[PDB]
Design a protein around this ligand. Structure first.
Ligand SMILES: NC[C@H]1O[C@H](O[C@H]2[C@H](O)[C@@H](O[C@H]3O[C@H](CO)[C@@H](O)[C@H](N)[C@H]3O)[C@H](N)C[C@@H]2N)[C@H](O)[C@@H](O)[C@@H]1O
Ligand SMILES: COc1cc2ncnc(Nc3cccc(Cl)c3)c2cc1OC
Ligand code: NA
Length: 254
């Protein structure tokens, strides 16, 4: 069982937009750090499982929550991790908009760090063909949230987004180690420093634009100038807009 690690903590049920899994926040225990327990049943358990192995693999390189405990049974996955103290990049942007330049600088450096991890270390695949297949299996089961499409695709039928996506293909792949969901909700700041990332479930090998696109979009809600810096700090001279557009369209399906 699990209980030894759970005496003393009190419980809260977070909703961070998290696909499928129930997230409990464990707190209140003195001399003990906040904890998260992710719980997935049925198919979603696979997803909790995927995150555990990636947390476990990736922490050899980046700063992650540590796996205090994981349980898999035929239909249920439970994942207990330590919390990363701090606020999301998004919150820190909102609260201190005269700090965006250092936050985007920090985000780029960090993303460069992740991507510099040599692929020969990484046992996980998440290239477009993998994701594309996944995206179809969510389209053709009507799980794609058309409500949440980016503005330039607002109210489009899903089967359209799908069709317009394959027009940009093909592009030259480049392969690095990617986060999978490099959004402003998933990087944790504290005392001005970037100190860790969360939500590592889609981590694997893919085109860098998988991470660059998603973050660049999030900074769309603040300043086109902030978006520019992201690419500028990272060191790309001319953003591959085709690639950007493809990855943003692929995220629509998840
Ligand atoms: N559905 C489940 C997913 O929900 C969010 O992802 C969605 C984005 O948020 C959407 O975009 C909107 O939100 C962005 C800021 O987050 C804005 O910049 C943008 N203009 C907005 O249209 C985008 N179209 C699809 C993407 N799947 C979570 O991050 C992700 O973890 C979670 O799995
Ligand atoms: C303070 O903001 C957060 C910190 C976090 N610190 C650690 N873990 C987080 N979430 C979490 C959710 C599921 C699984 C795991 Cl390992 C972590 C956190 C989520 C947060 O909300 C975005
Ligand atoms: Na680590």
């Amino acid at each position: 069982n699990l209980d030894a690690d759970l005496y003393g903590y009190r419980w809260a049920r977070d909703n961070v937009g998290q696909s499928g899994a129930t997230i409990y926040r464990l707190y209140g225990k003195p001399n003990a750090p906040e904890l998260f327990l992710k719980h997935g049943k049925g198919s979603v358990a696979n997803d909790v499982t995927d995150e555990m192995v990636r947390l476990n693999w990736l922490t050899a390189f980046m700063p992650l929550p540590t796996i205090k405990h994981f349980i898999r049974t035929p239909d249920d996955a439970w994942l207990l991790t330590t919390a990363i103290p701090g606020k999301t990049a998004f919150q820190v942007l909102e609260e201190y908009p005269d700090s965006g330049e250092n936050i985007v600088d920090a985000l780029a450096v960090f993303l460069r760090r992740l991507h510099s991890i040599p692929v020969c270390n990484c046992p996980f695949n998440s290239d477009r063909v993998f994701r594309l297949a996944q995206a179809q299996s969510r389209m053709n089961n009507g799980l794609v949230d058309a409500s949440d499409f980016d503005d330039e695709r607002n109210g489009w039928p899903v089967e359209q987004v799908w069709k317009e996506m394959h027009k940009l293909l093909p592009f030259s792949p480049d392969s690095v180690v990617t986060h999978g969901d490099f959004s402003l909700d998933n990087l944790i700041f504290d005392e001005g420093k970037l100190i860790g990332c969360i939500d590592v479930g889609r981590v694997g090998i893919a085109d860098r634009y998988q991470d660059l696109a998603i973050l660049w979009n999030c900074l769309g809600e603040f300043s086109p100038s902030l978006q520019k810096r992201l690419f500028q700090k990272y060191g790309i001279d001319n953003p591959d807009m085709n690639k950007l557009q493809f990855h943003l369209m692929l995220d629509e399906f998840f």
